[PDB]
Amino acid sequence: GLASANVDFAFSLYKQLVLKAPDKNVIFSPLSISTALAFLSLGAHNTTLTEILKGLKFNLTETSEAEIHQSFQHLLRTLNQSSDELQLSMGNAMFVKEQLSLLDRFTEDAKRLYGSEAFATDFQDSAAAKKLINDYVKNGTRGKITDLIKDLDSQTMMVLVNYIFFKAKWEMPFDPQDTHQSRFYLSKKKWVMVPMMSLHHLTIPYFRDEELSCTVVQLNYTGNASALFILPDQDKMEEVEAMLLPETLNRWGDSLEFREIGELYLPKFSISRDYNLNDILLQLGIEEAFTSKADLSGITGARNLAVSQVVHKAVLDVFEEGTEASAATAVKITLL
Amino acid sequence: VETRTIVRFNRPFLMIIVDHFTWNIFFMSKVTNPKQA
């Protein structure tokens, strides 16, 4: 009943990203961002706290703080699986200014609920602290996310970091013998030649959404993960995007049925994006955390901390054998 | 006349990587231009 909040947040953030640049590729991990902001909210009070929690789309008349954090705690317990079949890991860390004493409640909550690692860092040497954090993220993403942090202010007091790593095989993998170059239309007029993978005579969950002018198909991974592909009719992408809502996802899930598909063609591709999320989070109602009125006194006991920036980077690689994706989020907290 | 189904991802599309049980979203993406590795 709380996955709907995370889906609400995912789609609300997506729409803001697309409004600013409607023709760019998009890749991000909403779960990484949600977890990082919930982690941060362990130290928040009053308006700063309620804005973060409502910004994450939780209903505070129906859910307690404890229930929210427990839902992230439970999620983290499952998102740590490992076999050649499917690798999925997620980790949280706090980089703490040297000599800065944290509240017992904050430290204990972070360890218990987010499984966080902690590192004392001298933020006065911003290049060293940057290297430290970027290497931590590089290790957690198995080399896939490098340079998460492009700059750090020397007045930084704490950085909260979340990373996610995903490597999976298709339940029905494509055979590269049947991958051939054909056209992908960027627009009705502009096309590019790309390797199109193909599958034949396949039975998969399928739904033609005539009302929303799009086709939905589900391609499973080996393991507890799936890929949902949504193909809007030409020129309908912007309206399909507006229909991205938890109820739409639920309706798609209820409407998928096994169907025999004669031919399916999917391109190989590898995309990457990085973001500064300050403006979008402000659009979602997270405001006081970024200002001199921030109330993050639940971290050290002093109300002298504000969020300077929230940054995110993510990569997606799709190919015949499976998919590799990873992302990381950093919440930079500076001294007031 | 037979009925058949063909799916061609040859224009911008969405890809959502989800947990099997909760359908929590691990990754959200839109491919407007399929760049190569």
Swiss-Prot record, chain A:
Keyword annotations for this protein? Acute phase, Glycoprotein, Protease inhibitor, Secreted, Serine protease inhibitor, Signal
- Any Gene Ontology biological process: maintenance of gastrointestinal epithelium
Q: Which domain of life is it from?
A: Eukaryota
- Per the record, GO CC terms? azurophil granule lumen; blood microparticle; collagen-containing extracellular matrix; extracellular exosome; extracellular region; extracellular space; nucleus; platelet alpha granule lumen
Q: Name one GO molecular function term.
A: DNA binding
DNA-binding region (UniProt annotation): 188-190
Statement: the UniProt record of this protein carries the keyword Glycoprotein: yes
Glycosylated residues in this chain: 46, 59, 80, 139, 224
PTM comment, free text: N- and O-glycosylated.
Tissue expression pattern: Plasma. Synthesized in the liver. Like the related alpha-1-antitrypsin, its concentration increases in the acute phase of inflammation or infection. Found in the amyloid plaques from the hippocampus of Alzheimer disease brains.
Answer yes or no on keyword Flavoprotein. no
Subcellular location(s): the record lists: Secreted
Family the entry assigns:
Belongs to the serpin family.
Give the quaternary structure.
Answer: Interacts with DNAJC1.
Domain characteristics, as noted in the entry:
The reactive center loop (RCL) extends out from the body of the protein and directs binding to the target protease. The protease cleaves the serpin at the reactive site within the RCL, establishing a covalent linkage between the carboxyl group of the serpin reactive site and the serine hydroxyl of the protease. The resulting inactive serpin-protease complex is highly stable.
**Leftover remarks:** Alpha-1-antichymotrypsin can bind DNA.
Main function: Although its physiological function is unclear, it can inhibit neutrophil cathepsin G and mast cell chymase, both of which can convert angiotensin-1 to the active angiotensin-2.
Name assigned to this protein: Alpha-1-antichymotrypsin
Q: What is the lineage of its organism?
A: Eukaryota, Metazoa, Chordata, Craniata, Vertebrata
Gene encoding this chain?
SERPINA3
UniProtKB/Swiss-Prot annotation, chain B:
Which part of the entire protein is covered? 387 to 423 of 423
Q: In which tissues is it expressed?
A: Plasma. Synthesized in the liver. Like the related alpha-1-antitrypsin, its concentration increases in the acute phase of inflammation or infection. Found in the amyloid plaques from the hippocampus of Alzheimer disease brains.
Q: State the name under which the record lists this protein.
A: Alpha-1-antichymotrypsin
Q: What is the effect of changing residue 15 to V?
A: Found in patients with occlusive-cerebrovascular disease; uncertain significance; Isehara-1
Cellular localisation: Secreted
Cite the domain annotation text.
The reactive center loop (RCL) extends out from the body of the protein and directs binding to the target protease. The protease cleaves the serpin at the reactive site within the RCL, establishing a covalent linkage between the carboxyl group of the serpin reactive site and the serine hydroxyl of the protease. The resulting inactive serpin-protease complex is highly stable.
Cite the source lineage. Eukaryota, Metazoa, Chordata, Craniata, Vertebrata
Q: What else is known?
A: Alpha-1-antichymotrypsin can bind DNA.
Q: How is it modified after translation?
A: N- and O-glycosylated.
Instruction: Give the family, as the similarity comment puts it.
Output: Belongs to the serpin family.
Source species: Homo sapiens (Human)
Subunit info here reads:
Interacts with DNAJC1.
Gene symbol here is: SERPINA3
- Function field: Although its physiological function is unclear, it can inhibit neutrophil cathepsin G and mast cell chymase, both of which can convert angiotensin-1 to the active angiotensin-2.
